[PDB]
Amino acid sequence: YFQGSVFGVPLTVNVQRTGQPLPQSIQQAMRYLRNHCLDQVGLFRKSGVKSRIQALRQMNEGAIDCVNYEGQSAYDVADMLKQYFRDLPEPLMTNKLSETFLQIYQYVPKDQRLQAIKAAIMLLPDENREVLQTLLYFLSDVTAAVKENQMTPTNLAVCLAPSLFHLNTLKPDQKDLNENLAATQGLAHMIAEC
Amino acid sequence: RRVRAILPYTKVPDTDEISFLKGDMFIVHNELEDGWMWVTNLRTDEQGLIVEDLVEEV
């Protein structure tokens, strides 16, 4: 793993190199979105621009100084976050957690689904749990402005679950499609109640 | 429960949505929060997510 690299670097390497699982570039991106972008209609849905997103990645990778995001399109930054969580070596929510969500929504009754989800999250590594707590707080703050951005928790889940779970998409078996639906449902449930 | 699309829509890339044309009928498999529905498009035989705002019950 190269020195000062953000994308494609697992959270454990980030912890061993800096002491925190999320890089400061990604945290500053989240702060920029929280401070100057929460009212943008269709955030995380309206696509950015490939050139601007690639310039943002250029900024992140190799920069020893602090990465400034002022004067950047909100959708470019949102798509950059989606690409960072997509470009992780393993998904933030481990490959087993999508199957666990499927098992929860299939065999666990509705009144105990939240407890099973919390237990499943507690079965994750410490770094993944910290990053997930930070990201869930951020997405709750985002969806709190639903009167301005029209981003409901389920809408945010639809936009972000493929990046967080590393799901498949068709143009895949039935079990995998059920896993996709259950992962989206679980992400929406976690975002709605945070 | 079946629905019919009243407007064309293109999938957001790298998501579980499905594109459809005006008139496409879907069979609703699951109903989610905020008007989202997991459905199978009868034209393309693909399963995915659609929003209630673009469909009408039949």
Numbering used by the authors:
A (entry chain B): 1070 to 1240, 1258 to 1280
B (entry chain A): 282 to 339
The authors write:
RhoGAPs enhance the intrinsically inefficient catalytic activity by directly binding the GTP-bound GTPase and contributing a conserved arginine residue, the so-called catalytic “arginine finger”, to stabilize the transition state of the GTPase enzyme active site and catalyze the reaction. This was the first RasGAP identified and is a key regulator of Ras signaling. p120RasGAP is a multidomain protein containing two Src homology-2 (SH2), one Src-homology-3 domain (SH3), a Pleckstrin homology (PH) domain, presumptive calcium-binding C2 domain, and a RasGAP domain.
We determined the co-crystal structure to 3.2 Å resolution, and observe clear electron density throughout, including the key residues that mediate the protein-protein interaction. We, therefore, determined the co-crystal structure of DLC1 RhoGAP domain in complex with p120RasGAP SH3 domain. The p120RasGAP SH3 domain latches onto the DLC1 RhoGAP domain using its RT and n-Src loops and additional contacts are made between these latches by residues in the β2, β3 and β4 strands. The most notable feature of the RT loop binding is the direct interaction with the catalytic arginine finger residue Arg-1114 in DLC1 RhoGAP, located in the αA-αA1 loop. Specifically, Arg-1114 forms a salt bridge with the sidechain of Glu-298 and a hydrogen bond with the sidechain of Tyr-290, and additional van der Waals interactions with Val-293 in the RT loop and Trp-317 at the start of β3. We observe no material conformational change in either the SH3 domain or RhoGAP domain upon complex formation when compared to the previous apo structures.
